Short mmCIF file of C-alpha atoms in Angstrom, two decimals:
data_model
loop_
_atom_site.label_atom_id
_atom_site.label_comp_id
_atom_site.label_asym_id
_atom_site.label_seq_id
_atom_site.Cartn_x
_atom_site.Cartn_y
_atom_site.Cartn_z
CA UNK A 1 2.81 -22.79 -19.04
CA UNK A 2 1.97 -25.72 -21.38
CA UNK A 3 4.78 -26.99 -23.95
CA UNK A 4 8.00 -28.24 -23.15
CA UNK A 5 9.55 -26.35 -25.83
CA UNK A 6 9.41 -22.80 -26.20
CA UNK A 7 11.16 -19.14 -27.99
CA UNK A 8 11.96 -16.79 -25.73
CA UNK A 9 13.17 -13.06 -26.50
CA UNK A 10 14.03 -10.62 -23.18
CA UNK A 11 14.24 -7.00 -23.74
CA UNK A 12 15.51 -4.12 -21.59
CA UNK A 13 12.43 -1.55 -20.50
CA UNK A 14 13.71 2.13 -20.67
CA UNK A 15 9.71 3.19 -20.26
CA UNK A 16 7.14 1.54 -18.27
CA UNK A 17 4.74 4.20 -18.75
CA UNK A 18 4.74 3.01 -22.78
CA UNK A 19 4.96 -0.48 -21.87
CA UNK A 20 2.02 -0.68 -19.74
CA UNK A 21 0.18 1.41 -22.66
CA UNK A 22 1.02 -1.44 -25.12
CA UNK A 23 -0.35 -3.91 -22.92
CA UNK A 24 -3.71 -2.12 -22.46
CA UNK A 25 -3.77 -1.13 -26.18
CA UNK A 26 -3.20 -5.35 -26.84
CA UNK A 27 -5.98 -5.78 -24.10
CA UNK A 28 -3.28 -8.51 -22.58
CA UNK A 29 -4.58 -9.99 -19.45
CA UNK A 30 -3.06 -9.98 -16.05
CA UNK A 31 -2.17 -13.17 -14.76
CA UNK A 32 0.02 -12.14 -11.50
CA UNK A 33 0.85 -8.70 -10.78
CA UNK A 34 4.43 -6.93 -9.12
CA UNK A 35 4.74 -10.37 -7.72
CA UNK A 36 8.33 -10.82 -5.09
CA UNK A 37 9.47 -13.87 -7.01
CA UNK A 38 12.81 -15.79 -5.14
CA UNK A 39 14.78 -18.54 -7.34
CA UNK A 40 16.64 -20.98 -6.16
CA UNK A 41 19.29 -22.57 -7.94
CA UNK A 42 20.26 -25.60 -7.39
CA UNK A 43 23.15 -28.01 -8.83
CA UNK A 44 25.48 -31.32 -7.93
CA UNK A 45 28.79 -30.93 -7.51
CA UNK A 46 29.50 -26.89 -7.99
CA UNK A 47 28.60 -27.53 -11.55
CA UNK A 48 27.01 -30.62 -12.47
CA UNK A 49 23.87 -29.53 -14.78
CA UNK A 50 25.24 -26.44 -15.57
CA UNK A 51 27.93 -27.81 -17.41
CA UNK A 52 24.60 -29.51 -19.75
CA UNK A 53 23.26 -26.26 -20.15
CA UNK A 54 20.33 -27.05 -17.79
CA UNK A 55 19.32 -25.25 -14.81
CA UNK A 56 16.92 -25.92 -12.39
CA UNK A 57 15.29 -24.30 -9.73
CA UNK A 58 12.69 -24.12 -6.98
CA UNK A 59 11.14 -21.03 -7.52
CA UNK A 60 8.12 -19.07 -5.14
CA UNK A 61 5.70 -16.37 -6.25
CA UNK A 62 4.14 -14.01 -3.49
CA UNK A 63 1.86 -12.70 -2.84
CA UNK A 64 0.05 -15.49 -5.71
CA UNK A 65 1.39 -18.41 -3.96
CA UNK A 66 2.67 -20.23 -6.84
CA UNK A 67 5.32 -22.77 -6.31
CA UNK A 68 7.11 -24.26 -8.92
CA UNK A 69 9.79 -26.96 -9.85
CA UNK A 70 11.36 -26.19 -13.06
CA UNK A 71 14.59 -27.52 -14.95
CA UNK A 72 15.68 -25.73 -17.72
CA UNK A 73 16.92 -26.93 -21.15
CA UNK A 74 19.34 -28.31 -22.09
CA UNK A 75 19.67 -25.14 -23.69
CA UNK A 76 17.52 -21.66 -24.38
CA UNK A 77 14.27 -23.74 -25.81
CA UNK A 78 13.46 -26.72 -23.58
CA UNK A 79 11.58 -25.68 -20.38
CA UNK A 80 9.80 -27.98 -18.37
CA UNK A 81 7.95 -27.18 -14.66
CA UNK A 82 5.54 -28.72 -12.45
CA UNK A 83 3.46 -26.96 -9.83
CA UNK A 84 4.63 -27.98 -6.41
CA UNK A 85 2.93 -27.92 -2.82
CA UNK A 86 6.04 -27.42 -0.65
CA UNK A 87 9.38 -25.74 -1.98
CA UNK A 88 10.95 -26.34 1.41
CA UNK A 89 10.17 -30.29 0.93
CA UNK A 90 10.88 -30.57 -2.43
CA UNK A 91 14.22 -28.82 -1.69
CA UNK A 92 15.14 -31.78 0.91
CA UNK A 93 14.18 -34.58 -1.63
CA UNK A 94 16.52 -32.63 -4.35
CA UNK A 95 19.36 -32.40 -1.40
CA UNK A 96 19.39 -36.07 -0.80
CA UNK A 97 19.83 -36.85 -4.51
CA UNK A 98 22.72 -34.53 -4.52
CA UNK A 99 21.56 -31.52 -5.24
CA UNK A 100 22.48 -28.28 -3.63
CA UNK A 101 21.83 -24.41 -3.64
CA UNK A 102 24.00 -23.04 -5.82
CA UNK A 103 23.12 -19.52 -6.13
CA UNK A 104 19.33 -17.28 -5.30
CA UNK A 105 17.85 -14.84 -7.82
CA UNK A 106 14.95 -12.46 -6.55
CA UNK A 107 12.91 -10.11 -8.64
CA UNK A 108 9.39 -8.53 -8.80
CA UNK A 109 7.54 -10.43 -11.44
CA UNK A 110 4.08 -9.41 -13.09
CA UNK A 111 3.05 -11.83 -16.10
CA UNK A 112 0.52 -10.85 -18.96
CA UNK A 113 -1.30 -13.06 -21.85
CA UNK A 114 -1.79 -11.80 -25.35
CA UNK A 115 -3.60 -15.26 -27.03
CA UNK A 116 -0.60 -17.76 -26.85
CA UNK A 117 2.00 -15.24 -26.22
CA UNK A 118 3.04 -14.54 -22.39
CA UNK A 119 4.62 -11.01 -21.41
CA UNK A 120 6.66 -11.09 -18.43
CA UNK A 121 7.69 -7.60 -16.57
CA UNK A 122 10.90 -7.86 -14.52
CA UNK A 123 12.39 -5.71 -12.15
CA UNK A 124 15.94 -6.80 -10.59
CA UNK A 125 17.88 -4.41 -8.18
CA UNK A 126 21.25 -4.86 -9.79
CA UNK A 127 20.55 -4.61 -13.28
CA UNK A 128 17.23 -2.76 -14.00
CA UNK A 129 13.75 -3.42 -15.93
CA UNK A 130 13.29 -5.97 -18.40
CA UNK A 131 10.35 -7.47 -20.55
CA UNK A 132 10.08 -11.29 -21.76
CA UNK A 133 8.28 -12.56 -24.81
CA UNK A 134 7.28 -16.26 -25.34
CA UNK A 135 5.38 -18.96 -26.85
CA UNK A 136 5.16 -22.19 -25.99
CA UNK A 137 4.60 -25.36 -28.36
CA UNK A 138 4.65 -28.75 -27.39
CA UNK A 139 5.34 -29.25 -30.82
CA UNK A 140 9.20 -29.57 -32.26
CA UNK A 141 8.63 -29.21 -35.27
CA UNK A 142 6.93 -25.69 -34.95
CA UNK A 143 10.33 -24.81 -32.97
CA UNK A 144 11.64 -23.06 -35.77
CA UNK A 145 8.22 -20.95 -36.88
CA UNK A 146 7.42 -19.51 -33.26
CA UNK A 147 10.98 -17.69 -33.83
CA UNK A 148 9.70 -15.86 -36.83
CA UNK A 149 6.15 -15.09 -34.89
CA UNK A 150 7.47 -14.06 -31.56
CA UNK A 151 9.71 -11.65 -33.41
CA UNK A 152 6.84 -10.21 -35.17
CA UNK A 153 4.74 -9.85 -31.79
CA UNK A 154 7.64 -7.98 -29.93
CA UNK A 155 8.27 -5.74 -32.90
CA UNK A 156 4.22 -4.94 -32.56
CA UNK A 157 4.70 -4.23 -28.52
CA UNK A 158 7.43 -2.17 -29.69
CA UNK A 159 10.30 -4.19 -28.32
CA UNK A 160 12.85 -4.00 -30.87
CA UNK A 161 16.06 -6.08 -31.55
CA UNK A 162 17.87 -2.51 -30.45
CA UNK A 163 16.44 -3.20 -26.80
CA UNK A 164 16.81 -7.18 -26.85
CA UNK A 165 19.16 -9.13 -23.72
CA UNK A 166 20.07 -12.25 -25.27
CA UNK A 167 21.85 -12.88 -21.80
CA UNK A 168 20.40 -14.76 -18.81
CA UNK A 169 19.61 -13.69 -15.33
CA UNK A 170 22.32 -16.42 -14.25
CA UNK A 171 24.76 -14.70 -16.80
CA UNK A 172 24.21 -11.26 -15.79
CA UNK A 173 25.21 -12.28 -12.83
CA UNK A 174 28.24 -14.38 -13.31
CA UNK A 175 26.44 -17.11 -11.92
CA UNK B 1 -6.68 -37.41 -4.01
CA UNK B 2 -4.27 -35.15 -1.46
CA UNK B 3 -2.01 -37.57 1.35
CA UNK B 4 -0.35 -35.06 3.81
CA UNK B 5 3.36 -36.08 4.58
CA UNK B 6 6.76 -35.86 6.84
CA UNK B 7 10.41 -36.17 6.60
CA UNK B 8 10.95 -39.72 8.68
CA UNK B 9 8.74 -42.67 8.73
CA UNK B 10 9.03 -45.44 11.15
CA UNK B 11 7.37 -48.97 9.99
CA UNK B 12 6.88 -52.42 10.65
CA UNK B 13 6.06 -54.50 8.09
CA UNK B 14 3.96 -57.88 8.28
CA UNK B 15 3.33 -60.96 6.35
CA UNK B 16 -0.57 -61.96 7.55
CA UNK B 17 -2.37 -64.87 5.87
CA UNK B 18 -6.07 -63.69 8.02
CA UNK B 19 -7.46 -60.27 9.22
CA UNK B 20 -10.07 -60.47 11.73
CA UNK B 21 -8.05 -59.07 14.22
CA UNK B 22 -7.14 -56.17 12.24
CA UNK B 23 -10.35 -55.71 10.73
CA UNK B 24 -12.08 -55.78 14.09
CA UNK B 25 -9.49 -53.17 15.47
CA UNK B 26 -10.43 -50.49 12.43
CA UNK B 27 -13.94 -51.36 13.13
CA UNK B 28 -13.77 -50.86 16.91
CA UNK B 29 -11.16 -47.51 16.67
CA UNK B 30 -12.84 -46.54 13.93
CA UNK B 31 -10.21 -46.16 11.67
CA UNK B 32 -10.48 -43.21 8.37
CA UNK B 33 -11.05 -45.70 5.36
CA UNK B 34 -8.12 -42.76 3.48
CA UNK B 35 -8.96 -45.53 -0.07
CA UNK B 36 -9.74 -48.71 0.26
CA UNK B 37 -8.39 -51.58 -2.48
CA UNK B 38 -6.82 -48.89 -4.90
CA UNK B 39 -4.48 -50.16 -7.88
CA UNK B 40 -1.11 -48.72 -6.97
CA UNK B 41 1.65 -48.83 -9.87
CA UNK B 42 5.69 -47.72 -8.25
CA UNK B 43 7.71 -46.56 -11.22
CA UNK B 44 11.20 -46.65 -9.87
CA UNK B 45 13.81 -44.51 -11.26
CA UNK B 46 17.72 -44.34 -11.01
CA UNK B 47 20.68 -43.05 -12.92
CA UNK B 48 23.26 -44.92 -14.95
CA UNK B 49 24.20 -48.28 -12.76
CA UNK B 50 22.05 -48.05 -10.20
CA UNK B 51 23.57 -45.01 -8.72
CA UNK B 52 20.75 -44.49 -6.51
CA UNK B 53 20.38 -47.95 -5.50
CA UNK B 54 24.11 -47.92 -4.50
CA UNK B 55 23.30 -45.06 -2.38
CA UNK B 56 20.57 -47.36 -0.32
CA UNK B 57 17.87 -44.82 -2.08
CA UNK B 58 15.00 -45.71 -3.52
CA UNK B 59 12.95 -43.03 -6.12
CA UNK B 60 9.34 -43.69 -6.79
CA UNK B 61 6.50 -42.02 -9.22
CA UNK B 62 3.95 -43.85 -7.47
CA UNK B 63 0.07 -43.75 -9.08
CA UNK B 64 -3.01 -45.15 -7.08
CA UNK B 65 -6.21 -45.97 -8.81
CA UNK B 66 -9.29 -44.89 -8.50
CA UNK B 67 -8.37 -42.64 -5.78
CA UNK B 68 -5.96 -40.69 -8.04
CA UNK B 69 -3.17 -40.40 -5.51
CA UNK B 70 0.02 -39.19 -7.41
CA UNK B 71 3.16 -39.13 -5.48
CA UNK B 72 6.58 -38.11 -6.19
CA UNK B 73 9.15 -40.08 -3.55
CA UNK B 74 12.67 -40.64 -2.07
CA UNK B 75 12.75 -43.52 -0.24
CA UNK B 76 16.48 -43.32 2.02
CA UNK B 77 19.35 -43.25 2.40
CA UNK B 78 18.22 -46.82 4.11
CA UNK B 79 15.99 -47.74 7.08
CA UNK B 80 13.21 -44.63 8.52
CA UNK B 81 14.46 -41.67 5.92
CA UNK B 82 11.50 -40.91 3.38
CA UNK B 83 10.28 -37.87 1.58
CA UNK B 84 7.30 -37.76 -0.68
CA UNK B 85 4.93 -34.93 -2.17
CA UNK B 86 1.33 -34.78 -4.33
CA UNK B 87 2.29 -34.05 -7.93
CA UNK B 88 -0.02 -32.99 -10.08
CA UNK B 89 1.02 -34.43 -13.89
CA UNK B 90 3.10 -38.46 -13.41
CA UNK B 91 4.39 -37.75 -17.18
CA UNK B 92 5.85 -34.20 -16.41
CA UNK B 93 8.02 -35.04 -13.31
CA UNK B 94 9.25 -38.00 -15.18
CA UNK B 95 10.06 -36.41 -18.20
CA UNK B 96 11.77 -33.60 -15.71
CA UNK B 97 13.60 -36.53 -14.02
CA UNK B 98 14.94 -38.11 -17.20
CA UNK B 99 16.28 -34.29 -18.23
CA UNK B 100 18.78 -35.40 -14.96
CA UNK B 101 19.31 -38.72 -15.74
CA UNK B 102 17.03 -40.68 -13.88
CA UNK B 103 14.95 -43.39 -16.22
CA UNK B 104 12.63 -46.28 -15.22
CA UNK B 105 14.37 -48.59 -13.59
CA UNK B 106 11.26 -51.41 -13.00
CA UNK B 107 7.61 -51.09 -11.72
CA UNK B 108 6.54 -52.55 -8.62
CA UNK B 109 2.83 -53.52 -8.79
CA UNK B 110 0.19 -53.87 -5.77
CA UNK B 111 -2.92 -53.51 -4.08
CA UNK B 112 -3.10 -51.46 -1.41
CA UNK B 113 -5.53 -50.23 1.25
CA UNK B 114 -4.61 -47.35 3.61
CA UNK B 115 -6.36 -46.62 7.26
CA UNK B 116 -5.74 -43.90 9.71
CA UNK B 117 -6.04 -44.30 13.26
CA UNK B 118 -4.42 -41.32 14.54
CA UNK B 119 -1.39 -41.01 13.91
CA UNK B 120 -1.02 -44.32 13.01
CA UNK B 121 -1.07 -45.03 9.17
CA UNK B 122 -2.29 -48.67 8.71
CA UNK B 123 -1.47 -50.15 5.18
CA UNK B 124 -2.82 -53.68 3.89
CA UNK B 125 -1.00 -54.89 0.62
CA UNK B 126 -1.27 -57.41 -2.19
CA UNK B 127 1.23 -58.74 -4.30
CA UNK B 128 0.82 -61.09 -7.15
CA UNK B 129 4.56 -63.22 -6.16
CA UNK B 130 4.55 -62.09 -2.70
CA UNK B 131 0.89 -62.39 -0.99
CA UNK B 132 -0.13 -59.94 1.95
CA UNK B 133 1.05 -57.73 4.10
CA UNK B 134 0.14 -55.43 6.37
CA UNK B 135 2.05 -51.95 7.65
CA UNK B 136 1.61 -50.23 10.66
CA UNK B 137 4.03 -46.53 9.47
CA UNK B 138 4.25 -43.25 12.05
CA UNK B 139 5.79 -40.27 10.24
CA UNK B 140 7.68 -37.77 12.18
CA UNK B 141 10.21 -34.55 11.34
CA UNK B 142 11.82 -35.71 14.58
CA UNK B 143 15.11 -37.61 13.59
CA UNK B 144 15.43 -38.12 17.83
CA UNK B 145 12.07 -39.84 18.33
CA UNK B 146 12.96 -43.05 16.21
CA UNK B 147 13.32 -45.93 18.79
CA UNK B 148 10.73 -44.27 20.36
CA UNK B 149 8.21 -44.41 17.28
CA UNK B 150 9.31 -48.09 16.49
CA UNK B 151 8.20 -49.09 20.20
CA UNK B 152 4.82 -47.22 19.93
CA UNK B 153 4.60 -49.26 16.03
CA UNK B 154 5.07 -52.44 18.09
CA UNK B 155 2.51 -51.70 20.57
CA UNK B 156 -0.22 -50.70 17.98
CA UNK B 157 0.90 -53.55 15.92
CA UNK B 158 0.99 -56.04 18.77
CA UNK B 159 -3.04 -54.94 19.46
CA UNK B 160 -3.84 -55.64 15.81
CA UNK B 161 -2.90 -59.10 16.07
CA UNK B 162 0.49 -58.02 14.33
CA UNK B 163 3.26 -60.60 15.43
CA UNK B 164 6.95 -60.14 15.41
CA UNK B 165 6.41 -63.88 14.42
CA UNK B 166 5.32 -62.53 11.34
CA UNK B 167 7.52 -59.49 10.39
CA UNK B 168 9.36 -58.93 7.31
CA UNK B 169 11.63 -56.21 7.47
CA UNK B 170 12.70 -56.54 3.83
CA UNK B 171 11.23 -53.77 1.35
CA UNK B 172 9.20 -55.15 -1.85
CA UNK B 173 12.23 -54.74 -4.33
CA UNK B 174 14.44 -56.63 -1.82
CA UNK B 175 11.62 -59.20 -1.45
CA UNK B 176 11.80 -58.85 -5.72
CA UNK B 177 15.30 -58.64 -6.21
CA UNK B 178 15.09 -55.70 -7.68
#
């Protein structure tokens, strides 16, 4: 987290066993580990922001204690999100502007560093195990490059385009 | 700088043109000095015409300097209803904000002093068009309390040398215009 902008590619995991040996082979560094992480969606209307191609949501990490605000896009590479001290507040502030749960997502959650690229290890009930790669820029113009070099990294962690999910978590879901 | 919050807040609001009964009070209930003659800039936001304004809310990104208070707040629907919470980055929750559709609006300069006595939150404001005031705020979760706070405002007011010949129950942007 730093850069409004960012490329994103999400994998399924057939084999964590291989996975975690990639990330001590990369010597990636743990930032949270098999975190709970609970999501909460929120929108105006039934469909207000979704209907921009933004989400946002108020999302907690335990057992880290990381509480963020985030909105999403519009679209797959504009991410914004600011640490928060109270999700339950910040909830009530969103509710009297209009906004409402729409929908919850929970997973467990560990996140990795490998220099500027972030590895993400999901775990969700009703679908199944899935990695995330990503860079961040705050730069636009360097939109287009970090495509090409978050590619290349995956390809090097052995997450091919055979085993990418170009679909969300709120599309898996119907949501 | 961290202020802890509420969901409520009950206030009374004064116009004072001398403090010596206020400033004796603090002295003698020793009051917490939370920052003392900070520059406080209120970036108001709202959507399209005024949509929050139409609403009778009010949303600030308020910065206070040199203490380095930075608040995110909801001010409404109207009279006791306000929300706020520390943010760490102004510039990121506005830029977040705009991604909805809420844009500066105007900026409300002031300065502004804040003392604790309990409870009691004790406010003393400057304003180039508008001159002094003084606040005398409880916050509460309690929606049930209200009349009850207001009363207990009063009294503490009333022993500051805080007359109801002097109140001003407008806000600042009312007082503004804005």
């Amino acid at each position: 987290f730093v850069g409004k902008y960012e490329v994103e590619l999400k994998f399924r995991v057939m084999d964590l066993t291989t996975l975690h040996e990639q990330l001590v082979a990369q010597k990636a560094t743990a930032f949270t580990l098999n975190n709970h992480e609970k999501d909460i969606y929120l929108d105006a209307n039934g469909q207000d922001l979704a209907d921009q191609q933004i989400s946002m949501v108020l999302r907690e990490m335990n057992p880290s204690g990381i509480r963020l605000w985030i909105v999403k896009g519009p679209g797959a590479e504009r991410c914004e999100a600011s640490n928060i001290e109270d999700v339950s507040k910040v909830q009530s502030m969103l509710a009297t502007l209009g906004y409402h749960p729409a929908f919850t997502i929970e997973k467990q959650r560990s996140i990795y560093f490998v220099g500027k690229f972030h590895i993400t290890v999901d775990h969700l009930t009703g679908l199944g195990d899935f990695a995330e790669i990503a860079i961040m820029t705050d730069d636009a113009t360097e939109l287009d490059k970090l495509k090409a070099e978050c590619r290349d990294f995956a390809n090097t962690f052995g997450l091919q385009v055979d085993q990418q999910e170009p679909r969300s978590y709120r599309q898996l879901l119907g949501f």
